[PDB]
Design a protein around this ligand. Structure first.
Ligand SMILES: Cc1cc2nc3c(=O)[nH]c(=O)nc-3n(C[C@H](O)[C@H](O)[C@H](O)COP(=O)(O)O)c2cc1C
Ligand SMILES: Cc1cc2nc3c(=O)[nH]c(=O)nc-3n(C[C@H](O)[C@H](O)[C@H](O)COP(=O)(O)O)c2cc1C
Ligand SMILES: [Cl-]
Ligand SMILES: [Cl-]
Ligand SMILES: [Cl-]
Ligand SMILES: [Cl-]
Ligand SMILES: [Cl-]
Ligand SMILES: [Zn+2]
Ligand SMILES: [Zn+2]
Ligand SMILES: [Zn+2]
Lengths: 393, 284, 266, 266, 284, 264
């Protein structure tokens, strides 16, 4: 369905298609394809909006990043922030602190999440291509899209970027230490037909666990849904989904659909006869190598619950509706919002990335990363996991 | 249920004529003229008990007067309970339906309440048909009504509104029966109205539009009393087909379907519409 | 599962002008057929009186002439197809095994490793799907509470679809004429996946799909006769209501024809 | 003749809005399929490369999951339907008697006084007609020079239709792909009389007609297998050209599907 | 038949680039540039003998240069004789097609004669395609042409004419193939243009019209050079699809069909038309 | 007259940030926070009476406050009239349009001059049609250089990419609609086409149209006329390219959006 095609001379991708489906209670999967594929799942319109938004996001952070001169760290931003970036980059490269502060980085616009003071941060952290900050890659060679978001409203883009920030920082600290706040009942019934249908499907094919892995003390809920199966007929031996929201119910429902989306795309990749030469993205090729019951069992049997009883209900509490910015600021003042905009008709659409050198700068601790930051130090968690990248796409 | 159908009984001095949609009969009885005189005052419905009592006063054989009144088209028996117990009309112009509750009882149409869109805490019984009529259209008005009532048991909706020079009556949106909603209809019409020379109304222009919050209004010409008088009659007849005294059976292939009327030419157009690929009415 | 096809692969070749136009047409033949509409709708354009004039007749290429070439009924080695069952009774229990014989013989090869089915399809695309509907409490069930299943002709397996109650599923499938229909044990429902029917051959794929559907129900007709089941192909149902009831997304898939099965007796 | 129906009786109940709209749709799926257009047209929207991905597969109601209810192939008592014949050869003579067995068994009762045919029809209207096309000089003929006939399923007789030469009739019916088709002995052509398909049920009658057509060719498929004839249902033909060639008025009647018959050998 | 396709060969000093619809190739050979230079002058068709002679002069392997020229989209082999030997254009504006016979040879389109509708004793060979183009429409003009040529072996007709703001190219009328004629088309369009809100265009108003001798004209807007320039190109491309160098294959379900173009918006619409119930083209 | 443009205002611990399409500003004074709070509610329409009533209520300084909002890209003056007095056609095949000025008057289109691209020695409020059979980025840049600064000027470009005849969206500095180079970058963002356009520049040569005959030029002639007619008016009239396959004669409209990296 939808089925918009564009020729080789177009500004627009070759295909956008909404997928047909027999079951009215299964989610809609919409997808865009043009030489990775961007996709999204859920309610029909949101599936389309997601897929368009995901395509726009990737395009911007891979092709459209305008730099703004070439300045040293202490020249481009206030001093406390430039120290924080210096100490991040010091860990990420063999290069020394002398080399790091004399170096002129390509710059992008940004504002402080808390104070709204305007400054610049290094473009090398934001742009995913080699050409934008080519002479800066020695300092920061492993880049990703953690905290990235596209939306028609700026408050929405920032809300989105925050949720993505909290997802990944939660996920990394979860990965490294093994601690989760709580487990939700794997037999939980949400009342939402497309969520319940997915969960019932999963329990029939294999086993699920559902952990709340939110940053300790933070408001809201990062919910991580996990799946495994020994079953030899099944091609998906392992899958995962992760979302953050104020609501535990929403965060769980989002998480279950994120999971189904990874489960379904890989399943189709597999049954279609698609080869290694189709898999381009680095994090995707890793996620495919993790498709085995080991991945599930390694997570589950090493998880430590800070509350051992299983949550039969999706109720609120005194922590979960506090202020996320106050919580984040107590940990660090140096959290910056990259932003950009474009005109579409008479509207503005918005790109944002939440970035902090006092948190993890990307989610690949098998690459070059700031392992020491305000939420983790070397030797706090499981030592073997400091070296290995999480099984998450 | 014995339904009374439209007839007249006219007499000057000697002669007496029954005139109905089916026939014209020269009444030579005195009791039958009495009964016919009695039935003409009775508005729409009447109980088989009361009919027998009218016949018994006039000395007519109960079964042989019922065969008369049925065959000549004065009445008909109907035995099947409807899918919708009752109806309500929710509208931004409730003044336009002030007398409709009384008047449309003779058409066999049970309308419980005329409701203003401005009201709060409007409730609806199970198995009701909600007619939302709007002179000033806005999609959010419909969203509000669906939000409130979509999960009401046995519920179904009709929407009426104006677009360009046309009066649009959507097909029946029954969540139970799985039929297209308002938004499936209005998208059929808006594609049709654009200069594409193509049925499918989808470019990257449309894809970008879908990123914005779904809200809209429609262009439509200024209504007079006559355009409202036209609209009032179409609403009644559509409610009558669905829930009222049937006068002409509808085929099963267009019973639930949309009806669109050109207010200039006064031509009707009955069209069944498909589900819009982007609409969510099926997923709910 | 071994032979799974994702519709996402299909939808890559879909002309959306074609899809819209086929669906717009399709919907003209959908019925609103319920007991509560019986006295305010009709089905036949020809009155009851005059119908027997049109039933079980030949049209000639030379109307008025009789110069034919006769062919003997000595060449016939078949059975007469049984009268199509009406007024069904479910006094008896019916096994799953008897339903299994119907599904395996009508739609699948005897060799469970094979892909060749016992009816042909344009482009070997097979855009029609068979669903099975449990309509009686005296019908035996594979999985408790589940009255709609989807049959996988190659895998030769039932896939659970709905846990709607027996009454609702029979209400939707029987439409307005359930009184005469009676109490059948189960029904097959044949459905067109539009995008799979249109993606290779465009408009002609619809026609090819609809003819495929008849090849299927006829194999069912013939198979049922041989194992002692009366049947009836059935068109008097509200199309959108059967879809909703079987949890079908009508944007993707639609019921073309319902076929009833069971006994006729005391 | 005993069971003749005049279409003038049918046309009394015809909605002309319905007729126009069904025909307008129908014609979207007509093909212009000739040898002289082979290098300037195509049939498949999917490239040759990618086609095997879509052939002989199942679509699931639960894509990605495999929790099914398996049904044994021990319940199967049928034969495998033979591979559909391609590259036909007419080295052998084929009798009229063998064609007579096909027509009688597939479309008629064993009792020649009966009206019940061996496939069902909506309203017992039977709006589909079978024509028989002699395509080889080695095919035996009932009446010399006559290569198109119309079969009367109740009367159980052939009615002469055309004396077009064998070559022309095979040219029209085979369309662009005659090279691969080869030399079949004869073909059945199934046709919809529009007004008979629409007069009682309106738009839904078209669907019911097109499904009826498949019930017919499937009986042919099954019948042919049993008497030692390879066959192939065939959609690659120019629809208007087959009509003209068989002296059909396209305003009244149209070819839905062609089905080929004969031997495959040296 | 080796067909030459549209390409360019461009060089400044050092570099040499072949630009075709399929590809863009950096030519490092000297003989291949020579051959490519030779093929660019050759208008449309060329003999496999002559191609081999161009390759042989340049020292290119005959089969390994043919694989180059074919794969890069400079040429293609075609092996199937067409349904129509040749074409003629009969028109009331033959001036508009003066250079068309020469020009459309590079498009692979063999047009034997431009004929004036005013001429007498106009003959036509077997298996010809007759393109009747009319700026001033009259049904009798078409009747005359059908009368003359309908029984010519292998014949087929296209008609082009203007209606309201549209340029109409009818589907191919092939008496052999059994396809709709001009009058089947013009009746499709005239029903569509009337304000009926109904597909079937038949009342007693129409029945009475049928009593009068079938003659008519059409309303249509004043054509400029640009509207003729538009029309000339559509005519060429349609003749090219049917009888010329194929550049993009047409699907079999719309190969024979009508093409209608809005001269305002420049949107094309390809529609297959049915036989008009009243037309006699099938009975002939 | 005055159109209130789109913007956002992030406002947190005492501080307030105005972000417009063009600019980023630390909103110091609290009455301007109220001005900008209110003005966020508007959708692109106000008489100066409306705007000055809002300002004077706030007590910013009605004269200077209008200067601030114009500067920052919050508001601006929209031309009440249609935007172009006339058009001019600049071309490397101007012989193709000799009679265009004469003919097109009948369709309500007013082309004033045809101009040869090979020139040396263009009014106020002028639409410039730059039609090129032989395309080169530097030819468009050349024309953008000469007249980019003209009062009320806008540009439109048409050229041939192999089988496709291209008509870019209208580039209007005053309206703020994307340029030719925004089009080329978004296309190339996805031997490749960029590989081809790079060599052409790198070895100094234009991109020819692939074997245009009279009929193709006629097809092009008429599209240009009807496109000029459309511009003689929602934003999407301007921010929309037309693409015409010369083989199949199918036209295909597509929306336009800027490249951020582009200057225009
Ligand atoms: C496509 C199709 C639809 C049908 N629909 C109905 C139906 O809606 N109601 C019904 O009672 N019978 C239906 N039938 C059964 C026919 O009425 C039956 O086949 C016909 O009357 C001939 O009787 P027989 O099958 O007993 O020989 C249908 C048959 C077909 C092929
Ligand atoms: C409606 C229909 C149309 C068909 N059309 C064609 C055709 O045009 N050309 C052809 O070679 N085969 C045609 N076939 C035969 C199928 O290709 C064949 O059934 C399929 O490939 C499966 O192969 P099998 O029948 O040998 O098992 C058609 C079959 C059906 C049911
Ligand atoms: Cl939330
Ligand atoms: Cl309310
Ligand atoms: Cl009836
Ligand atoms: Cl092909
Ligand atoms: Cl003459
Ligand atoms: Zn809807
Ligand atoms: Zn005709
Ligand atoms: Zn630009």
């Amino acid at each position: 369905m939808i089925n918009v095609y564009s020729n080789l001379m177009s500004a627009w991708p070759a295909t956008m298609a909404m997928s047909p489906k027999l079951n009215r209670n299964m989610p809609t999967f919409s997808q865009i394809w043009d030489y990775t594929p961007a996709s999204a799942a859920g309610e029909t319109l949101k599936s389309i909006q997601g897929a368009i938004g995901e395509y726009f996001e990737r395009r911007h952070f891979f092709n459209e990043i305008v730099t703004g001169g070439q300045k040293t760290l202490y020249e481009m931003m206030p001093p406390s922030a430039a120290k924080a970036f210096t100490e991040a980059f010091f860990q990420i490269s063999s290069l020394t602190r002398d080399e790091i502060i004399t170096h002129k980085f390509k710059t992008v616009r940004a504002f402080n999440l808390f104070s709204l003071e305007q400054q610049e941060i290094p473009a090398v952290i934001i742009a995913l291509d080699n050409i934008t900050a080519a002479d800066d890659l020695k300092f920061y060679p492993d880049r990703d899209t953690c905290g990235c978001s596209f939306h028609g409203s700026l408050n929405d883009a920032i809300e989105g970027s925050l949720c993505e920030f909290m997802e990944r920082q939660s996920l990394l600290l979860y990965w490294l230490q093994g601690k989760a706040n709580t487990e939700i009942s794997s037999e939980i019934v949400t009342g939402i037909n497309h969520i319940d249908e997915i969960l019932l499907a999963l329990r029939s094919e294999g086993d699920i666990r559902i952990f709340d892995i939110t940053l300790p003390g933070a408001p809201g809920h990062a919910v991580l849904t996990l799946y495994g199966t020994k079953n030899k007929i099944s091609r998906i031996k392992y899958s995962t989904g992760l979302s953050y929201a104020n609501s535990l119910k929403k965060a769980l429902c989002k998480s279950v659909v994120e999971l189904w989306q990874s489960y379904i795309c890989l399943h189709n990749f597999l049954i279609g006869g698609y080869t290694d030469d189709d898999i381009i993205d680095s994090y995707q090729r890793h996620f495919m190598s993790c498709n085995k019951y080991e991945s599930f069992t390694d997570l589950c049997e090493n998880t430590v619950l800070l509350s051992d009883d299983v949550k039969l209900t999706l109720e609120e509490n005194i922590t979960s509706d506090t202020n996320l910015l106050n919580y984040l600021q107590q940990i660090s003042d140096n959290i910056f919002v990259y932003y950009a905009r474009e005109r579409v008709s008479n509207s503005l659409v918005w790109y944002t990335k939440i970035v902090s050198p006092d948190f993890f700068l990307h989610m690949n601790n098998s690459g070059a990363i700031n392992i020491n930051n305000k939420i983790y130090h070397t030797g706090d968690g499981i030592k073997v996991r400091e070296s290995k990248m999480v099984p998450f796409p | 249920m014995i339904n009374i159908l439209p007839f007249e009984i006219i007499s000057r001095n000697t002669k007496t004529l029954l005139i109905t949609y089916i026939s014209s009969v020269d009444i030579t009885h005195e009791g039958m003229k009495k009964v016919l005189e009695s039935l003409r005052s009775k508005q729409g419905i009447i109980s088989e008990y009361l009919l027998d009592k009218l016949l018994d006063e006039s000395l007519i054989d109960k079964d042989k007067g019922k065969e008369f009144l049925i065959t000549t088209g004065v009445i008909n028996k109907t035995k099947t309970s409807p899918l919708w117990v009752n109806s309500v009309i929710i509208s931004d112009v409730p003044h336009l339906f002030s007398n409709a509750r009384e008047q449309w009882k003779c058409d066999g149409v049970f309308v419980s309440h005329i409701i203003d869109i401005k009201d709060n805490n409007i409730n609806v019984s199970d198995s009701t048909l909600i007619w939302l009529h709007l002179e000033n259209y806005h999609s959010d008005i419909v969203k509000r009504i669906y939000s409130k009532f979509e999960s009401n048991p046995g519920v179904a909706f009709i929407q009426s509104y104006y677009l360009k020079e046309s009066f649009r009556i959507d097909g029946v949106y029954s969540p139970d029966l799985g039929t297209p909603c308002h938004f499936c209809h209005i998208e059929r019409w808006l594609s049709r109205e654009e200069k594409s020379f193509r049925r499918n109304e989808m470019s990257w222009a449309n894809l970008l539009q879908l990123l914005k919050k779904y809200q809209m209004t429609l262009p439509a010409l200024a209504l007079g009393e006559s355009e409202r008088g036209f609209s009032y009659h179409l609403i009644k007849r559509r409610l009558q087909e669905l829930t009222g005294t049937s006068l002409v059976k509808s085929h099963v292939d267009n019973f639930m379907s949309s009806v669109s009327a050109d207010l200039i030419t006064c031509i009707l157009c009955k069209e069944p519409v498909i589900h819009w690929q982007a609409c969510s009415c099926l997923e709910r | 599962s071994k032979h799974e096809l994702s519709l996402v692969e299909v939808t890559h070749y879909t002309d959306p002008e074609v899809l819209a136009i086929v669906k717009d047409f399709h919907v003209r033949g959908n019925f609103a057929s319920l007991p509560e509409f019986a006295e305010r709708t009709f089905v036949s354009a020809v009155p009851l009186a005059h119908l027997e004039k049109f039933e079980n007749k030949e049209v000639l290429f030379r109307p008025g002439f009789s110069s034919v070439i006769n062919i003997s009924s000595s060449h016939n080695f078949s059975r007469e197809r049984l009268p199509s069952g009406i007024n069904f009774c479910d006094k008896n229990k019916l096994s799953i095994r008897t339903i299994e014989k119907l599904l395996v013989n009508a739609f699948s090869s005897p060799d469970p490793g094979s892909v060749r089915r016992p009816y042909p399809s344009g482009g070997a695309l097979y855009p029609i799907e068979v669903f099975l509907c449990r309509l009686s409490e005296n019908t035996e069930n594979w999985q408790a509470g589940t009255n709609v299943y989807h049959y996988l002709p190659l895998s030769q397996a039932l896939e659970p679809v709905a846990t709607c109650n027996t009454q609702s599923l029979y209400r939707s499938l029987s439409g307005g004429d359930s009184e005469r229909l009676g109490k059948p044990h189960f029904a097959l429902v044949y459905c067109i996946i539009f995008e799979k029917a249109l993606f290779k051959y465009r408009y002609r794929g619809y026609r090819m799909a609809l003819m495929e559907t008849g090849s299927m129900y006829q194999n069912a007709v013939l198979v049922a006769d041989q194992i002692g089941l009366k049947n009836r192909v059935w068109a008097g149902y509200t199309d959108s209501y059967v879809a909703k009831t079987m949890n079908l997304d009508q944007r993707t898939v639609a019921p073309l024809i319902v076929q009833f099965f069971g006994d006729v007796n005391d």
